[PDB]
Design a binder for these strands. Structure first.
Lengths: 96, 50, 79, 100, 106, 93, 82, 93, 111
DNA sequence: TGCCGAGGCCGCTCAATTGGTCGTAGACAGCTCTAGCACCGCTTAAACGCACGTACGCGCTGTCCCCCGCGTTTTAACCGCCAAGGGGATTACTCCCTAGTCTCCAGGCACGTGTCAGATATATACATCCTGTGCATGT
DNA sequence: ACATGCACAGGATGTATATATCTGACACGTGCCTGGAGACTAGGGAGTAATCCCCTTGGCGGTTAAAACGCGGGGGACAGCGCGTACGTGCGTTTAAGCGGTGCTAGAGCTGTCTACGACCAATTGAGCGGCCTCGGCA
C-alpha cells in the first residue's frame, strides 16, 4: 500500500482557527499555503546555510536564523517576525 | 432575481466610470475600517502618520 | 499546425486581464512566438528533470521544479 | 444602461473589469494541451503528461502572458499610445533581460 | 508523559517537524536546539499574517471560505508581502483590479 | 552641436575607470551605513566593491533608459524613462 | 559626524555614467532623481551587508560582506573573491 | 598563520594550455577565481536540489550531468557533457 | 604496509588539469549532500575546466585583437558580452573594472 | 547679336582624429621553496542504491452538443505625419575647492591561539500524535 | 450533488532519557590596517552665458480595431485499456571512515625583466577657397 504523504495542512488549518474562527479554507487555497510554507522554509534554511559557511560555523543556530529572517523579509515584516522568534525562544528557554 | 446584487456593484462601477470619479486603480472608492488592519499594518500606518 | 490553437480572442482576453485597452492586429502572431519560446524553455527543463528521474511521464513536480529554477515560481501544485 | 457603446473602445473597459475580476484560465484546455504535447515531442518522443501538470504549465503561461501585457501597457502609455504594438513587447521583453 | 515542543514554545507550528527537516535537508552538519523553535515561530507568524489579510479579503468579498483570489488579493495589497513574493504566481489567482489611469475616460 | 556627445560616448565606453569620485562616494557609503548602526569600519576593498556594483548598476540602468527614450521616439532621457525602466524591471511596484 | 552627503554624486559624474550608457542628451530633471535611485540601491545593498557584519559579530565590513549582499540581490560581482 | 585556498594556479595552467604566449593580471585572476567558484556553487547547488527532489543521499555523475544540462545555455551544454563524459570514461579505466 | 611512489592525483588519472581532489573536498565540506560519489568531482572538474578553456580562449583572442598580451578584466568583459552563449550564462553578473560592450543605439547615429 | 553672369567643377591649403615610438616603473612571472597540510593508498566497514517484480491508479484513446471562434462589413477613434514655437540642454569659459597623493600617527580591531564546558548527536524505548479513511453535512 | 469537516484506527514519528565529545564562546596577546589629519597640489566642478535644436504641441488625414452581425466547428463532456509508477523486496557494489607518507600548492621572499602604461610624433582624413568653363538671359 502507498505510504502517507507530508503537508502542513492541520497546522495552517489550526492557525486559521486562531485568527478567523468563523471562517473556512478551500483545498485549492491549502495547496497554495502548503507550497508557501515549504518555499519560505526552503529560503530561510537555504540562506541560513550560506551564513553558516560564510562564518565557517558548523551549527544552524537561533543566533543566526535571526539574521536570515532580516535578510529575506523586508521592512516591518522582518521586525515583527524577529519579535515572534524572540518571544518563542524566550518561552522555550524558560520552559526547557 | 438575486444576480442583480452581483450586477449592481458593476452597474455602480459603470456609473462611476461615466463620471470618472474612480481611484488610481480605476476601482470604486471604498472606505478603510482600521479594525481590519494587522498589528504590523497598524504600526506601518502609524509610522506613515509621523 | 498547433500554435494557432492559441485563438485570436484568447490573446485578446489575456491582454484584457493584463489591462491593455486596444490591441494592434500584429500582436497575435508575434505573441504566439513569445508564448512558444516560454513554453519551450520550461519544457526543456521539465523534461530534463523527468528524464533524470527515469520516469517517462512529466509530473507536476517536474514542471514546478523547472518553473522554480527559472525564477517564475508557482504555488498550488504542491511546491 | 445609458452609455452602452459610448466612446467605442469602452466595452473594452467592461472586458478589462470582467477578465481582471474573474479567475477562469483564458486559453482553451484542449488547444493548449495539444500545444504542449506537440512542442515536447521535439525534445523527447513518447512522453506522457500528468493531467494536472499540463494545467500547471497553463497557469504559468497565463501568469507570464498577463505580466508581459501589463509591462507592455506601460511601454505603450509611455510612448503616448493607448494601443499596444509588437515594438512595445520588444521593449518590455528586452528590459526584463529575456530577448537581447 | 510527553509534551510537544510546539505547545511548550507557545506555537501551533510543528517544531519537531521543523527540527527534522533542518537536519534532513543538509542545511548544515549540526542544528542548534533553538533554531527550529525560532524558525517555526517565523513560519507561524507569516502564516497567521497572510491568512489574516486573506480572511478579511474573503469576508469583505462576502464569502465564508478563503479561495485563491483572497490569497492573491492579500499577497498583492500589502507591499511588504508583495516585495517578499515578487517572484511567485498563484494558482487560479487572477490579479489586482488595476486600470492604468491614462486609459480611463476624461 | 550634437557631435561631441557621440565622441564622449565612444571615449567613456573605450575606457574602464571609475566615473564617480572616490572621496564623495566613500563618504556617501558611510553616511548611508551610519543609520543601520553607528561606527562601522569599511575595509578599503569593500568601498571599491560597492562602487563597482553602483557604477555597473547605473550604467545598466541608463542602458535600458536609452531604450525607453528611443521607444518614445525622442532622444533625450527623462525621469519618465527611469521610472519606466525600474517599474518594468521590478525594483518598484 | 554626519550630513546629507548625497549631493557629492556630482552632476558631471552622472553625465559620465549616462555617457558610458550611451544616452545622447540628459534632461536636467534626471540628476536629482538619479541620486534617489542610487541612494535606494546603496541602502538596499548596505542594509544586507551590515547585517552580515552584525551576524559575524564584527564592526568591520569586508569585501565579502558586500559581495554576499550583492549575490542574494541577484547582482553577483566577480573580482573581490568568493 | 593563514591560507586563502585559490583556483589561481589552475586557471593559469589552463591559459598556458590554450594560449602559450599569454598572461593574467591578478585582477583578471580575481575575476576567474570568482567565476569558476560561482559556477561551482550553481552546479553543486543545482545537483543538490535535484538529488533532494529524488530523495537520494548521494550525488553522482548522472545528477551533476543533469545539473549541467539544466544550468548551462545552448551548445555549451552538449560540449560540457562531452568533456565530462570523456573525463569520467578516461578516469574509470 | 607500503604504498606507491608518486601515487597519482585524481586529476592526472583523469587527464584533467583542474584539482579533482579539491573539488571532492569542497563537495563534501560545503554539505551539498551526505555522500558524494567518486565520479562527481571528476565530471564537475571537467566541466569547470571546459568552461574555463572556453572563456579564456575567447578572452585571449579578444586581448590579442586588442593588441595586448596579458588578460585584464576588460578582455574578459569583451569576450563574455560578445558570445551569445556565455552572455546568457552570465546575465546576472558584473565584472569588476570590466567596462561595457561599446555600442551606440542605431537611431543616435548622424545622417 | 556680342556679352557676362550664375552655376558647376577642378585644383592646392588647411586644421582635426587616428596609428605609431619611446622609456620607467608597476606588477607580473618565476621562482625556491620550506613547509606544512591537503590529498591519496591502503584498509574495513555499513547502507544505500540497484535490479526484479506486480499490483493498481492514472493517462491514452475513443463518444455527444452548445458555446465560442470565425469571418463578415461598418465606421470612428486613433496613430502617424507634419509645421511651428520657444524652453531648456548644450558648449564654452572662469574661478574656486575639494579630490587625490602622500605621509605619518595611534588607536581599534581582526585575527590566531589556547582553554575548557556546555552544548548537541548519538542511540534507545515509550507513547501520542497525524495521516488516511467513512460519512455527516453545508454551499 | 458535491467539497468540506469530524470521529476512528494505527504506524511512524516525536520526546525523555542516557550518554559521549568537540564547537565555539571565551580571554588574551597581538600586529595589522584603518580612521584620522595635516599639508599640499591641480584637475575638476559650479555658476554664467549665448544660442542652438529639440521636444511639445495643435491639427489633419488615413487606416486599422472595435464593434455587432450571423454561422458552424470544435472544446468540454464521459467509457474502456494498459502501461506504466511506487512500493517492496533482497542483493552488491559503493562510499566513509580511518591514518601515515609525501606531492603539491602557497606566501613570502627576492629579484628580476617587460609589458603596458602616459606622453610625444607623423601620418591620413575631413572640409574648405582660388580658377576656368559654359548655359542661359540679354542690349
Amino acid at each position: 500500500k502507498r505510504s502517507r504523504k507530508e503537508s502542513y495542512s492541520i497546522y495552517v488549518y489550526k492557525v486559521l482557527k486562531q485568527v478567523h474562527p468563523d471562517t473556512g479554507i478551500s483545498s485549492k487555497a491549502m495547496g497554495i499555503m502548503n507550497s508557501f510554507v515549504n518555499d519560505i522554509f526552503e529560503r530561510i534554511a537555504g540562506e541560513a546555510s550560506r551564513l553558516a559557511h560564510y562564518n565557517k560555523r558548523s551549527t544552524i543556530t537561533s543566533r543566526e536564523i535571526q539574521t536570515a529572517v532580516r535578510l529575506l523579509l523586508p521592512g516591518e515584516l522582518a521586525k515583527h517576525a524577529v519579535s515572534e522568534g524572540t518571544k518563542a525562544v524566550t518561552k522555550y528557554t524558560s520552559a526547557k | 432575481g438575486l444576480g442583480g446584487q452581483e450586477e449592481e456593484e458593476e452597474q455602480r462601477w459603470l456609473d462611476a466610470l461615466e463620471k470618472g470619479e474612480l481611484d488610481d486603480n480605476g476601482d470604486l472608492k471604498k472606505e478603510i475600517n482600521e479594525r481590519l488592519l494587522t498589528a504590523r499594518q497598524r504600526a506601518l500606518l502609524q509610522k506613515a502618520r509621523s | 499546425d498547433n500554435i494557432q490553437g492559441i485563438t485570436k480572442p484568447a490573446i485578446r482576453r489575456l491582454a484584457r486581464r493584463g489591462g491593455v485597452k486596444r490591441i494592434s492586429g500584429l500582436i497575435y502572431e508575434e505573441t504566439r512566438g513569445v508564448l512558444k519560446v516560454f513554453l519551450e524553455n520550461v519544457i526543456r527543463d521539465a523534461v530534463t528533470y523527468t528524464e533524470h528521474a527515469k520516469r517517462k511521464t512529466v509530473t507536476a513536480m517536474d514542471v514546478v521544479y523547472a518553473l522554480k529554477r527559472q525564477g517564475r515560481t508557482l504555488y498550488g501544485f504542491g511546491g | 444602461k445609458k452609455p452602452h457603446r459610448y466612446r467605442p473602445g469602452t466595452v473594452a473597459l467592461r472586458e478589462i473589469r470582467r477578465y481582471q475580476k474573474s479567475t477562469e484560465l483564458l486559453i482553451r484546455k484542449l488547444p493548449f494541451q495539444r500545444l504542449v504535447r506537440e512542442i515536447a515531442q521535439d525534445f523527447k518522443t513518447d512522453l506522457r503528461f500528468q493531467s494536472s501538470a499540463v494545467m500547471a504549465l497553463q497557469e504559468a503561461c497565463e501568469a507570464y502572458l498577463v505580466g508581459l501585457f501589463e509591462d507592455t501597457n506601460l511601454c505603450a502609455i509611455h510612448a503616448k499610445r493607448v494601443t499596444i504594438m509588437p515594438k512595445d513587447i520588444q521593449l518590455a521583453r528586452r528590459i526584463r533581460g529575456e530577448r537581447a | 508523559k510527553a509534551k510537544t515542543r510546539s505547545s511548550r514554545a507557545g506555537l501551533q507550528f510543528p517544531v519537531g517537524r521543523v527540527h527534522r527537516l533542518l537536519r534532513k535537508g543538509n542545511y548544515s552538519e549540526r542544528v542548534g536546539a533553538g533554531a527550529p523553535v525560532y524558525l517555526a515561530a517565523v513560519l507561524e507568524y507569516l502564516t497567521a499574517e497572510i491568512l489574516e489579510l486573506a480572511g478579511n479579503a474573503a469576508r469583505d468579498n462576502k464569502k465564508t471560505r478563503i479561495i485563491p483570489r483572497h490569497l492573491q488579493l492579500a499577497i498583492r495589497n500589502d507591499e511588504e508581502l508583495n516585495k517578499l513574493l515578487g517572484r511567485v504566481t498563484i494558482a487560479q489567482g487572477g490579479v489586482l483590479p488595476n486600470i492604468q489611469a491614462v486609459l480611463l475616460p476624461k
